[PDB]
Design goal:
The structure is a homotrimer. The first copy, chain A, has helices at residues 16-24, 41-49, 69-82, 98-112, 130-141, 153-167, 179-185, 206-209, 248-266, 276-287, and strands at 4-9, 29-33, 60-65, 90-93, 121-125, 145-150, 172-175, 191-194, 216-219, 236-240, 243-246, 273-274. With 289 residues, chain A is α/β, with parallel strands linked by helices. Chain A is elongated, with a radius of gyration of 19 Å. The complex binds 5,10-dimethylene tetrahydromethanopterin (2 copies) and NADP nicotinamide-adenine-dinucleotide phosphate (3 copies). Chain A: Homotrimer.
């Protein structure tokens, strides 16, 4: 049968980005809905689980997206709640590319570290957005001592508490109100991620290149001024003295491949659940070829 | 040329269920619209009748759906009104699966009866919803003497009048306010259908298995408690004494195949009109 | 890579007509958005320019449509503004089919004239709609002395001013309130176009057939009464006493081929820009 992807977007209209990548992942047809909520998604899921039987079920799948991760998660939980017994299809959550971006970034850094970050300090500057929170979660699952930073302690602690509950980890929070406190926060860190909003610098070249402990720096911001000073957005494990850098476009190349590969996996079984953990497991395989 | 289905849904967004079945019926592409009304549908229909010529016209078709049958019918009449002369495409109406469900149910019962129900009493309990009304219409078109039941006579009579006007049949109405009256209403019936809302029992086992006249019972409710007591939802002509039973899942298997087959017919000509009568004609071929 | 067309419609929902012709033009998939504005289109364009690299970029393209040409143009300018450096895809603007209609009509009249209309008087009756304004734009670009007519001078002058600014030409306006003034307005004209609204006559047979200066007449109205009296909608350069005529269906045959060719070309490079000028350049090649 034809591979049908149902795209459920929490925004007013479905993401164009998610359509292109869905087709490049091998969907035969993508049918998109905007304004999806936990209340209206149940009837859409019924359409996917009562129309095809046996092996044909794996040819229908669900992708949840949109700009807001918390809204995407509520819809994704309502999808999983509507399934029962054998009445289910594979599903994926990737609101604004946040899961695939964080999975790509953490997989590349863990590989560059020699395959382990256990017991080492990892700092996620501006870690209160969805990319920073998913990065913190994946690093903490790998055993890193994670400090999730932001301009206000209350917001940073609420982000750490949310990650800790969802992923069963113990990330800690720190307030970094200014440039100087972000330079102080990376002292003694082995791994540094900048997960800031687009077009902002969070850490100059002098604040990381003179810190002996820093092994690898990773930046998710591709718009100049880049999150980390002294690197290029295309860096992908480029050496700077004894340290290695990953720029946003170096990470982005793997994120695009991973997102397409997750879509293809949705049609290989009718019971896949692709959220951060499963997406990250695939990212690590794809970083080792 | 590619088989293009245009899906016109009266609800805020198009039915996912209708998309999957449309693709499995052989549409190459489905383009769906929500909030479709008799007023905005005309311009959509123009796009289907002025873009392709000759043999290619049959490669575009229209499917009308949504949760409200009366709203679907108004859009479907506006679609038919927009065509003129040879400027037309095939169209189907199946709001909430009501046509394909009723067509499958009645086709299976008529086949199990030996191919005729003419002159025999058929009772449709909770027959005032779209499935019950379309079932009453198809049974009456087969010559059965149909009694359409509901909790209030005014609503049951309005449903019978609507069916009678649309289909040129003579269905009668009856008030059955509770279990006792439903049990009384089936006495002397040869065929009994339960078309109740989801998850409700309407006819316990003792209300039909001891009625000598009853030949076949059919239930459209798949959610326990089932409309008919003493049967399984998967029953598909299963024998109980000298009687037969069709559960909702036994009927639903044919409805899904029937719906897919109707979609494929839309692309075989530019003049098909798939409403209850034509869907039912195909359901009978598919049961034989 | 699959050829993905992103349809951005300024109306509440995307045009059905544009979907059918996009598919027949060779798009593998069409994904449509309604309510597109200069403000929300930027994020949609980002989805087209950051998802594919190298030779795959040209397999995604953009089509802008809707019933209002000015609204379409604002969306189309915002699409072009979002591109930067090599981060771009091919795009087309054809709100309500007006660019592909005007380009087909003007191309045929210019070819039939021997390849030039420079310095000759061209009159566009009811030229204030998008087809008339685009015809006046393309004719003025060909060096014709263009008079754009309408029932009220203010509306005709506003249309002329808009064309002049956008295309850098010098179209003049004239008020022709009725049949008598329209018959007076064509005196001395070598080329006449009727770009009136559907189902209206603007130029009776006696108002053009006895004027010696007139060489070719062209009508965009396909619905009787036709814009030009004494012709058939299928006429395509047909001779009427030393003069040639083009009816709306004769022009339309070129138009349907031109629109398909524009869709196919969107996937041949990532830098095509299909507005009036480029559509007209292609229409001129296809008429040969
Ligand atoms: C605005 C877009 N909207 C989205 N929307 C959703 N739903 N999901 C997303 O992932 C994104 N984005 C993803 N984005 C995005 C993703 C990848 C690249 C390009 C890549 O980062 C690489 O540059 C290339 O694939 C080539 O690879 C090369 O470039 C460098 C090195 C090398 O590997 C650009 C933008 C945008 C930030 C952003
Ligand atoms: C929630 C859904 N929404 C819709 N929406 C619309 N637009 N149209 C519809 O027909 C439906 N439905 C169709 N529905 C629906 C249709 C078929 C089956 C399953 C079938 O009844 C059969 O069970 C199987 O095809 C396999 O066949 C076997 O399984 C058992 C028996 C046997 O026949 C279940 C639910 C739902 C009641 C309901
Ligand atoms: N390539 C891709 O596919 C892709 C996909 C998704 C995201 N991205 C990129 O990844 C990065 C992170 O994405 P996101 O969605 O998680 O980011 P985000 O939510 O927009 O912002 C992350 C955090 O940045 C901090 N911030 C905002 N303005 C600031 C300022 N003026 N100074 C200091 N800090 C500031 C905020 O933290 P506090 O308020 O707590 O300080 C905010 O929570 C972005 O640059 C984005 O473009 C790329
Ligand atoms: N397999 C499929 O694909 C498919 C497709 C469509 C429908 N169905 C099923 O078919 C059945 C009929 O559908 P429908 O849409 O026609 O049903 P409906 O409109 O929801 O309900 C039918 C009638 O049931 C009666 N009713 C409601 N609540 C009741 C109560 N508490 N006690 C007694 N009667 C009650 C009402 O009649 P009165 O008020 O007149 O008494 C009502 O008009 C449903 O069970 C539905 O799930 C299946
Ligand atoms: N085959 C195709 O793909 C296709 C595509 C697009 C257009 N067309 C055809 O091309 C023609 C022109 O299209 P359009 O969108 O540019 O036209 P339009 O905007 O609907 O009308 C053009 C002009 O006609 C004049 N008009 C309207 N009612 C009139 C009346 N009662 N008497 C005299 N003049 C009147 C108006 O000018 P004033 O108010 O200034 O007098 C109006 O601005 C139409 O016939 C249309 O059907 C064909």
């Amino acid at each position: 049968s034809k591979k049908l992807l149902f795209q459920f977007d929490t925004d007013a209209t479905p993401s164009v980005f998610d359509v292109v990548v869905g087709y490049d992942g091998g969907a035969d047809h993508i049918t998109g809905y905007g304004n999806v909520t936990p209340d209206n998604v149940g009837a859409y899921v019924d359409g996917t689980i009562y129309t095809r039987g046996g092996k044909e079920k794996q040819s229908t799948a669900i992708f949840v997206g949109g700009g807001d991760m918390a809204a995407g998660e509520r819809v994704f939980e309502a999808v999983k709640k509507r399934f029962f017994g054998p009445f289910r299809v594979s599903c994926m959550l990737d609101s604004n590319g946040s899961n695939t971006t964080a999975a790509a970034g953490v997989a590349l850094v863990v590989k560059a570290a020699g395959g382990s970050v256990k017991g080492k300090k990892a700092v996620v500057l501006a870690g209160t957005g969805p990319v920073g929170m998913r990065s913190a979660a994946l690093l903490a699952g790998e055993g890193a001592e994670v400090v999730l930073c932001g301009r206000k302690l209350d917001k940073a602690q609420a982000a750490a508490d949310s990650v800790n509950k969802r992923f069963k980890v113990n990330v800690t929070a720190a307030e970094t109100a200014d440039d100087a406190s972000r330079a102080e926060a990376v002292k003694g860190a082995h791994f540094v991620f900048t997960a800031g909003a687009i077009g902002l610098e969070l850490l100059p070249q002098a604040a990381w290149q003179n810190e002996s402990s820093i092994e690898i720096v990773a930046d998710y911001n591709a718009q100049p001024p880049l999150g980390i000073g002294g690197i290029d957005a295309t860096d992908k494990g480029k050496e700077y003295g004894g340290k290695r850098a990953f720029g946003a476009l170096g990470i982005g190349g793997l994120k695009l491949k991973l997102h397409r590969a997750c879509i293809a996996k949705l049609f290989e079984s009718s019971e896949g659940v692709f959220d951060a953990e499963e997406i990250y497991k695939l990212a690590k395989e794809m970083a080792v070829d």
